[PDB]
From a paper:
Ribulose-1,5-bisphosphate carboxylase/oxygenase (Rubisco) catalyses the addition of carbon dioxide to ribulose 1,5-bisphosphate (RuBP) in the first step of the photosynthetic Calvin–Benson–Bassham cycle. Rubisco catalysis occurs at the interface of two ∼55 kDa large subunits (LSu; encoded by the rbcL gene in the plastome).
Here, we describe the crystal structure of the activated form of Rubisco from A. thaliana at 1.5 Å resolution with a bound transition-state analogue, 2-carboxy-d-arabinitol 1,5-bisphos­phate (2-CABP). Clear electron density was observed for residues 13–475 of the 479-amino-acid LSu and residues 1–123 of the 125-amino-acid SSu. The A. thaliana Rubisco structure is in the ‘activated state’, in which a carbamate formed at the catalytic lysine residue (Lys201) is stabilized by Mg2+. Interpretation of the electron density indicates that the A. thaliana Rubisco SSu protein sequence in the structure presented in this study contains the RbcS1B isoform. There is only one amino-acid difference between RbcS1B and Rbcs2B/RbcS3B in the residues that were resolved in this structure: residue 22 is a serine in Rbcs2B/RbcS3B and is a threonine in RbcS1B and this structure. The resulting occupancies and difference maps were most consistent with this residue being threonine at full occupancy (data not shown). Furthermore, there was no mixture of residues at any given SSu amino acid in the structure, indicating that the Rubisco isoform that crystallized under these conditions was homogenous with respect to RbcS content. The crystal structure presented in this study provides the structural framework to interpret A. thaliana Rubisco kinetics and interactions with accessory proteins, and adds to a growing database of higher plant Rubisco structures.
Author numbering:
A (entry chain I), D (entry chain J): 1 to 123
B (entry chain A), C (entry chain B): 13 to 475
The structure:
């Protein structure tokens, strides 16, 4: 038996139990998002990488769920490279930020995909 | 007024009737006793589920049977079946109490199943009109809200029933919950029959489970839940338990909607809407009612009734696991649970087109006898909007609960990426799993234990 | 701890076990799938309704399966079936939440009916131990207290469901009630599906029925009641309805315990005890569960469950009317509802000896397709401690509700006096009715209408 | 069609919708009581022949349910003529009274039979 570490294993929701994705693997996730007609959007965070409770504690209330939006959603986008270009541009201005890619279905109005694309060196 | 018995078909068999868009419609599988014509058997069903009794009453003349009676409007013989047919009954909107599944079932399935003149009766489907649906709250939150509250996107959620079913102490329950959640499961849950008992009282359990939720959430960085069971002997106890879960700040409770009942479930659904609690619904007792093809009620009727009364999850079967669930029927009623509009499709057991007029969708929960090797088939059947639950499939791992949770999480995410990069889960599933054993020891230990375990028996309720 | 799947019978088939006086015992009619031996089928039913799941869990070692596991302790074959067998399961007392029928059913019938490895399954009986029975209030009042409150002794009570089932207004409902009660019926009742609806809202109906109860009682000099339906979509609505009945000062309300559900029903039973209201229980939906011999739950199980949860009356069938009721089976569960102690008697379907430790007895209610000519048989089947209900048999009389009530009351009192003077109701019934027509033109008019009306069909659920 | 009178038809619970019992039929009902091992008792009433509500009106509460006990229950007496002698003694002492015969099952503690035996001239 091997024991699952109780430290140093902080997670990032979907895909974060797999080894870190490669840039082609990140591009292929964007490809899947676009093939499903979802709207891609980049979000980034510099201070609270994980959910916390500071301002409330009632059922279903947490802090740290909202990140900051990077520009706007790429409506009518057709290139996963354009999404990765904004991740690189965000990486360059905020190298200490976590950065994630999300995807919206505007008919159901639900984010149908979400995965981290960059983690800062402080992590 | 002429006293005496008539044939029901004289009033209640109306094959020329045109259904109204406010009607509740029912499809019954009817097996009349020898010698009973289908028109009379179908009229008897319509009559004694709406306005009529066994002999003519003079009080009919005070009102209008034309406007109130249920009507058998169509008879559909069943192929390969000598006397059994489908009867179609239309019930006017005014027959029903607004917001009350209890009342709707009281009319449609109240007395008709015990009639001497019938040998068997099954309710297969109902068409709920938008005019009646809008009288129901439905789920307290629904799929979109739940994913938004939990911050979980892009994959099925993962759960786990703590085991043994009964016999664990409150402290030991919380220990298992912590070790499960910290390994990558989103949820764990009380077993359906874990309520309050000598070996473990409910309030002690809720307290230690809260400690486990918050410890495992702090450890992993992901929002965690444990379905705390509010099922109880009285509504007062049920609410008491939900109030304490609200005090603890936890995200999700559960209820056994059939053994608790619809009246209690609706009250709990309203409370959860009022207090922001997700409500997982366990369908304990359903197979007493829904297993046999010739008599009872199909699960799709029970699933629609829950979506009306209210729940954010409901168990919907696995197809591949230890409990029966025909694949095509399951695909049909999963759509009935999740979607806003479901077209008539007898190939999936959908007798009527169902419009849900924006009532929230219910997350289907696949649970029971499933393990890591089933992950590709489960992901393929249900897609992202489901909860896949592994009780024995986690607490049965040879390294314990956390490695067992890691195995299930790894397998699931491996299926997701494989699917997203274009692979066929229905054909490459086993190779997808073997590739992940290459870098996940936790998954490798899980695959070795359950490699040869499948559940294949003849399906009893087929389309 | 050894990870992996093993056979349930290794742990849950214990043919050497001796049941304890605190165990809950269950008799299951099991039809396993081909190839599944009875020992394994029985052990799977015991395991998955108590402590076990599909693979071995390490957490078993934290507690004691020895003290907590359910056990299939006996397996006996079914005469006339090749695969089907009765499996006897013993459940420790600690498995169950005190006072909760909901919890008891959740274990015993929660998941096992859907196992792929079983083709069919039916729960035939339960042995409720005194140590569990004493955790339940049971009926709010029971047979003795009810007779004393209403001052009624020496004959079956008489009731009547207002018809048409749905569509009458509140004012016309009270009109029908008054005319029925003033003719000699002790009770009338809301139909099971009369809750609150567009054609008649509940509060309006309660108000006018109160005017009718008190007018008819002032006229006749005998205490009258009308079962006011508390069945509702939510526990809050249910309790609101009972509170208004309390304000009105009336003696009796009703609840549909299966469609409302056990959690709600237990709450109402407690309310009725707290406020002195008699509680009539309607069994709407029961035949969805209890009709077929091979799968479901026998009504005697649902009848015991109602006596535990609580009710002063429960419908028990007619045998000779429009709904099925096997004679010997009915005499069996009538005893289980009324008596303090019922010895095992397989000739009447009583699988276990049942001690009630002074829990109050429930009045059985015979209702559905019965008329004056049935009075001798009903009186003979049930005896004095019963309620006989004539909806169509009263509102279908050619002279109206009051003469229909008189016909029924005269027909019953004729049987009482005949039986009391030595006549055999089972053989001289038609003579008794005929002779009473001489001075009762009302009875004479009912006899003319229904003289050739009988309900004879093949009995689906035979002993 | 015949109309049931809404006046002049006051009733007296079990058997009161049949023709009045003869003295042989009254005794026949007493024989039935004794054959079942029930124990008989005579009750009479001078002022409230019917249930009413004066002192309360909550569910299940009515006035006029208790009558006055004539002597005591006839424990161990198993002759119908003894019971009917007590009716006769009552009826001569209280000619303006209603008089009924009841029978208790003492194992169940339920009155198993009850029927009127005399009604006063004022009625
Ligand atoms: O009691 C049980 O068996 C479970 O906890 C599963 O245990 P395992 O995960 O250990 O198998 C679930 O409640 C069943 O899946 C319910 O059945 P369904 O989903 O069909 O309603
Ligand atoms: O809805 C009905 O049909 C009844 O009002 C009977 O009406 P009638 O008197 O006009 O027949 C009763 O509720 C049934 O007897 C219930 O069935 P059961 O007693 O078997 O549960
Ligand atoms: Mg379970
Ligand atoms: Mg009815």
């Amino acid at each position: 038996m091997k024991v699952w570490p109780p430290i140093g294993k902080k997670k990032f929701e979907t895909l974060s139990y797999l080894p870190d994705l490669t840039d082609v693997e990140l591009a292929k996730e964007v490809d899947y998002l676009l093939r499903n007609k979802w709207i891609p959007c980049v979000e980034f965070e510099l201070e609270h990488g994980f959910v916390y409770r500071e301002h409330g504690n009632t059922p279903g209330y947490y802090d740290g769920r909202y990140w900051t939006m990077w520009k706007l959603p790429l409506f009518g986008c057709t290139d996963s490279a354009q999404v990765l270009k904004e991740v690189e541009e965000c990486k360059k201005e905020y190298p200490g930020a976590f950065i994630r890619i999300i995807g919206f279905d505007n008919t159901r109005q639900v984010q149908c995909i979400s995965f981290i694309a960059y983690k800062p060196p402080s992590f | 007024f002429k006293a005496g018995v008539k044939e029901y078909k004289l009033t209640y068999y109306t094959p020329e009737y045109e259904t109204k868009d406010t009607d509740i419609l029912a499809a019954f599988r009817v097996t009349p006793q020898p010698g009973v014509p289908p028109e009379e058997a179908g009229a008897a069903v319509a009559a004694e589920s709406s306005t009529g009794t066994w002999t003519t009453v003079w009080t009919d003349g005070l009102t209008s049977l034309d406007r109130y009676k249920g009507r058998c409007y169509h008879i559909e013989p069943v192929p390969g079946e000598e006397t059994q047919f489908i009867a179609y009954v239309a019930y006017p909107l005014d027959l029903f109490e607004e917001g009350s599944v209890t009342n709707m079932f009281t009319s449609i399935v109240g007395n008709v199943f015990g009639f001497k003149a019938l040998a068997a009766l099954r309710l297969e489907d109902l068409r709920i009109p938008p005019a009646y649906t809008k009288t129901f709250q439905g789920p307290p939150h629904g799929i979109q809200v739940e994913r938004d509250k939990l911050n979980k996107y892009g994959r099925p959620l993962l759960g786990c029933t703590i085991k043994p079913k009964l016999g664990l102490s409150a402290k030991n329950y919380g220990r298992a919950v912590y070790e499960c959640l910290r390994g990558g499961l989103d949820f764990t849950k009380d077993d359906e029959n874990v309520n309050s008992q000598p070996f473990m009282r409910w309030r002690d359990r809720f307290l230690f489970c809260a400690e486990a939720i918050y410890k495992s959430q702090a450890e992993t960085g992901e929002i965690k839940g444990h379905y705390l069971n509010a099922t109880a002997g009285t509504c007062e106890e049920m609410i008491k338990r939900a109030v304490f879960a609200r005090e603890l700040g936890v995200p999700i409770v559960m209820h056994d909607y059939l053994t608790g009942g619809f009246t209690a479930n609706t009250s709990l659904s309203h409370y959860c809407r009022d207090n922001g609690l997700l409500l997982h619904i366990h369908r304990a007792m359903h197979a007493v009612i829904d297993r046999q093809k010739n008599h009872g009620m199909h699960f799709r009727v029970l699933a629609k009734a829950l979506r009306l009364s209210g729940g954010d999850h409901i168990h919907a079967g696995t197809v591949v696991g230890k409990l029966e669930g025909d694949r095509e029927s399951t695909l049909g009623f999963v759509d009935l649970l999740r979607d806003d509009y479901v077209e008539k499709d007898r190939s999936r057991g959908i007798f009527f087109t169902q419009d849900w007029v924006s009532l929230p969708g219910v997350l289907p929960v696949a649970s029971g006898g499933i393990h890591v090797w089933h992950m590709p088939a489960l992901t393929e059947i249900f897609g992202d909007d489901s909860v896949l639950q592994f009780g024995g499939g986690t607490l049965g791992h040879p390294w314990g609960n956390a490695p067992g949770a890691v195995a299930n999480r790894v397998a699931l995410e491996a299926c997701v990426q494989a699917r997203n990069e274009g692979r066929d889960l229905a054909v490459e599933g086993n190779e997808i799993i073997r590739e992940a054993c290459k870098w996940s020891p936790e998954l490798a230990a899980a695959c070795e234990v359950w490699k040869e375990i499948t559940f294949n028996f003849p399906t009893i309720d087929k389309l």
